[PDB]
Design an enzyme around this catalytic site. Structure first.
Site, PDB file in Angstrom:
ATOM      1  CG  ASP A 126      31.426  -5.505  49.867  1.00 14.51           C
ATOM      2  OD1 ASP A 126      32.183  -4.585  50.214  1.00 14.51           O
ATOM      3  OD2 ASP A 126      30.394  -5.819  50.507  1.00 14.51           O
ATOM      4  CG  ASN A 152      31.371  -8.601  53.446  1.00 11.94           C
ATOM      5  OD1 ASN A 152      30.702  -8.290  54.427  1.00 11.94           O
ATOM      6  ND2 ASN A 152      31.562  -7.762  52.462  1.00 11.94           N
ATOM      7  CB  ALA A 193      29.575 -19.418  58.834  1.00 12.49           C
TER       8      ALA A 193
HETATM    9  N1  LIG Z   1      25.331 -16.749  58.038  1.00 11.18           N
HETATM   10  C1  LIG Z   1      26.193 -16.422  59.036  1.00 11.18           C
HETATM   11  N2  LIG Z   1      26.610 -17.344  59.932  1.00 11.18           N
HETATM   12  C2  LIG Z   1      27.279 -16.576  60.832  1.00 11.18           C
HETATM   13  N3  LIG Z   1      27.998 -17.118  61.858  1.00 11.18           N
HETATM   14  C3  LIG Z   1      28.527 -16.504  62.961  1.00 11.18           C
HETATM   15  C4  LIG Z   1      28.924 -17.326  64.034  1.00 11.18           C
HETATM   16  C5  LIG Z   1      29.525 -16.751  65.167  1.00 11.18           C
HETATM   17  C6  LIG Z   1      29.762 -15.359  65.251  1.00 11.18           C
HETATM   18  S1  LIG Z   1      30.437 -14.717  66.593  1.00 11.18           S
HETATM   19  N4  LIG Z   1      31.977 -15.092  66.651  1.00 11.18           N
HETATM   20  O1  LIG Z   1      29.738 -15.267  67.709  1.00 11.18           O
HETATM   21  O2  LIG Z   1      30.290 -13.312  66.679  1.00 11.18           O
HETATM   22  C7  LIG Z   1      29.331 -14.542  64.188  1.00 11.18           C
HETATM   23  C8  LIG Z   1      28.742 -15.111  63.052  1.00 11.18           C
HETATM   24  N5  LIG Z   1      27.264 -15.260  60.572  1.00 11.18           N
HETATM   25  N6  LIG Z   1      26.376 -15.183  59.498  1.00 11.18           N
HETATM   26  C9  LIG Z   1      26.250 -13.997  58.795  1.00 11.18           C
HETATM   27  O3  LIG Z   1      25.556 -13.927  57.796  1.00 11.18           O
HETATM   28  C10 LIG Z   1      27.018 -12.777  59.239  1.00 11.18           C
HETATM   29  C11 LIG Z   1      27.967 -12.191  58.389  1.00 11.18           C
HETATM   30  F1  LIG Z   1      28.202 -12.674  57.143  1.00 11.18           F
HETATM   31  C12 LIG Z   1      28.710 -11.095  58.846  1.00 11.18           C
HETATM   32  C13 LIG Z   1      28.476 -10.555  60.118  1.00 11.18           C
HETATM   33  C14 LIG Z   1      27.555 -11.152  60.984  1.00 11.18           C
HETATM   34  C15 LIG Z   1      26.828 -12.247  60.523  1.00 11.18           C
HETATM   35  F2  LIG Z   1      25.910 -12.775  61.328  1.00 11.18           F
END
Ligand SMILES: Nc1nc(Nc2ccc(S(N)(=O)=O)cc2)nn1C(=O)c1c(F)cccc1F
Length: 259
Positions: free
Chosen positions: A130, A135, A87
């Site tokens: 949840d 999440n 994401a």
């Molecule tokens: N699958 C998923 N994609 C991301 N994307 C993402 C992009 C940028 C940032 S940031 N703003 O840089 O901190 C953080 C995440 N997260 N990810 C996860 O499963 C995921 C989650 F669900 C919760 C927490 C952390 C994660 F990693």
């Protein structure tokens, strides 16, 4: 099928208890994804092996634009690896820390997306249980994506912060889909106010606030928002609306968006 040598690992996206999520790229295809690396040791100690199986089971079969895809899994001597959809716009948790609170239009849009993803979930008898900003992820077009199906079971079944859990769940009672409708009300409140309605400095106090449904609205929360939140935050699960009712609420229809 899957090995660590198939991926080029990059920046950490999240860190936690059981392990971290990293940005990764599949070498053969150049497919960008997110690799959740969990540690067997910790998973064993907590006894969450069932929950991880359920995450994998549920997220690999669900197909919805507002639900995070799980593409596959693998494991080695000490670690389990989940291959997730990446994401790009991060967590709603992080977005809320940055803007402090959201306008009605953004809130109603997020609530619509969530409600649509939850209707799809419930039509397959899957109850998330949840839903919380940590999440919820944001796609490249800023669309909301539900991410951690670890605590999800098939309704009507029977822990960290209590903030999003309904009374029937914190009391250990029997619960169903209506649990996700309570969570929606907690999220709608937090999106507009910047803090969940039952927040406290202790678990003991939050428990009291939730069991007693003790929330007050600040001055800026409009009547439409107050009506939807109050309808969602009912002690009696059957008194909570259906997801159809939520999508058709006048505050939702007046502030949301469409593809
Ligand atoms: N699958 C998923 N994609 C991301 N994307 C993402 C992009 C940028 C940032 S940031 N703003 O840089 O901190 C953080 C995440 N997260 N990810 C996860 O499963 C995921 C989650 F669900 C919760 C927490 C952390 C994660 F990693």
């Amino acid at each position: 099928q899957w090995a660590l040598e198939d991926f080029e690992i990059g920046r950490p996206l999240g860190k936690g208890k059981f392990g971290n999520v990293y940005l990764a790229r599949e070498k053969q295809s150049k497919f960008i994804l997110a690799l959740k690396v969990l540690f067997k040791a910790q998973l064993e100690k907590a006894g969450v092996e069932h929950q991880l199986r359920r995450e994998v089971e549920i997220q690999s079969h669900l197909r919805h634009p507002n639900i995070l895809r799980l593409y596959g899994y693998f494991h080695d001597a000490t670690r389990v690896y989940l291959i997730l959809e990446y994401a790009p716009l991060g967590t709603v948790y992080r977005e809320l820390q940055k803007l402090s609170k959201f306008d009605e239009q953004r809130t109603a849009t997020y609530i619509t997306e969530l409600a649509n993803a939850l209707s799809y979930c419930h039509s397959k008898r899957v109850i998330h249980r949840d839903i919380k900003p940590e999440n919820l992820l944001l796609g490249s077009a800023g669309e909301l994506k539900i991410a951690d199906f670890g605590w999800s079971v098939h309704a009507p079944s029977s822990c960290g912060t209590l903030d999003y859990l309904p009374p029937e769940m914190i009391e250990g009672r029997m619960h169903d889909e209506k649990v996700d409708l309570w969570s929606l009300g907690v999220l709608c409140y937090e999106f507009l106010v910047g803090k969940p309605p039952f927040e406290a400095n202790t678990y003991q106090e939050t428990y009291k606030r939730i069991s007693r449904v003790e929330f007050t609205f600040p001055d800026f929360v409009t009547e439409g928002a107050r009506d939807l939140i109050s309808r969602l935050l009912k002690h009696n699960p059957s008194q909570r609306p259906m997801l159809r009712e939520v999508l058709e609420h006048p505050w939702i229809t007046a502030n949301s968006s469409k593809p």
